[PDB]
């Protein structure tokens, strides 16, 4: 549902022209029951009724980042969660501009999957620890904590333009929470992911000891989605893929990157990193 505030302006027009009494912010008063009737139809139906479902992703415009307007409160009271998009972060560079402090979900682990439950349980703790430190201008540049590193890398990974496959996300977040992407600098956090998902380095550089685990098939997702990476068979192969990817990266690409001093090559690299932020 695109802007429901417009759906309420239409109801206000209809009501007030029909000589209905106004209310708060000019609305008739029963504009809450409107969205209630609309959104309570969302459900995950019982097996008696076919195990069907329909998700609802209503959209509400906001004026100067206020959540005090009548319609916004009426809808937050109805909807389970919310995905708060802040202009200060959109304008602040990062896109999508979700604010985790104000965005929540009242379903949690039960919605997401086995493979994603463990990663989210790690990421929630990492972000709760990183929120307390991230306000500090990094001064202990070598004395920085692991959390300050992993949280920044995860925020880099959160930058997107389009969607991402499940297999193309769990591995990228696993490398962050487990610290495999700690030696590379922040700016290269997404070029790393691009090579991790679309340019298999061990298959290129010949370091192929893993039996099956490679990020080219796109069908391993349905094994991760069932067994989970925290399993006897996927965990060691995952480690013996990511560690060689990090090693080959740090050796060949990171070293070549830091050696750039020319303005032309530096800008070429800059545009490449932004492009990797976009496509991935």
């Amino acid at each position: 549902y695109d802007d429901l505030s417009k759906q309420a302006v239409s109801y206000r027009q209809i009501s007030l022209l029909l000589r209905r009494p106004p209310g708060r912010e000019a609305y008739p008063g029963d504009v809450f029951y409107l969205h209630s009737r609309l959104l309570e139809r969302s459900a995950m139906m019982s097996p008696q009724k076919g195990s069907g479902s329909l998700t609802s992703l209503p959209i509400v415009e906001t004026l100067s980042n206020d959540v005090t307007a009548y319609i916004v409160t009426n809808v937050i009271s109805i909807t389970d969660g919310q995905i708060y998009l802040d202009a200060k972060l959109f304008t602040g560079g990062q896109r999508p501009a979700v604010n985790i402090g104000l965005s929540v979900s009242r379903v949690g682990s039960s919605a997401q999957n086995k493979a994603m439950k463990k990663v989210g349980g790690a990421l929630k703790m990492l972000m709760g620890e990183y929120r307390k430190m991230a306000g500090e201008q990094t001064s202990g540049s070598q004395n920085v904590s692991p959390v300050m590193i992993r949280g920044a890398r995860c925020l880099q990974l959160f930058n997107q333009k389009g969607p991402s496959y499940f297999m193309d996300a769990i591995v990228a977040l696993y490398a962050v929470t487990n610290g495999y992407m700690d030696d590379v600098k922040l700016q290269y956090s997404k070029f790393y992911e691009f090579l991790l998902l679309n340019k298999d380095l061990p298959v290129l550089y010949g370091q192929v000891n893993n039996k099956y685990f490679y990020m080219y098939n796109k069908n391993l997702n349905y094994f991760i989605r069932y067994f989970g990476l925290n399993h006897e068979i996927l965990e060691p192969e995952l480690k013996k893929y990511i560690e060689i990817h990090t090693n080959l990266f740090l050796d060949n690409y990171q070293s070549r990157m830091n050696e750039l001093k020319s303005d032309e090559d530096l800008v070429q690299l800059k545009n490449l990193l932004y492009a990797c932020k976009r496509t991935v």
């Binding site: 430190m133 306000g135 800059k270």
Partner: protein, 49 residues
């Protein structure tokens, strides 16, 4: 040579900060982490001793 200011560009340094996190509580967090690390190190020594 002047300054290694951080930024989004690779020649610039890491910007580990997060705009979402507040700066008002930062000094209290710094003091808390320093005190906690000191207590943990002292506990390491006390457990060995």
């Amino acid at each position: 040579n002047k300054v290694k200011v951080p930024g989004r560009k690779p020649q610039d340094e890491e910007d580990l900060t997060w705009a979402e996190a507040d700066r008002k509580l930062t000094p209290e967090e710094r003091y808390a982490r320093d005190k906690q690390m000191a207590l943990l190190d002292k506990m390491t020594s006390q457990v060995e001793e």
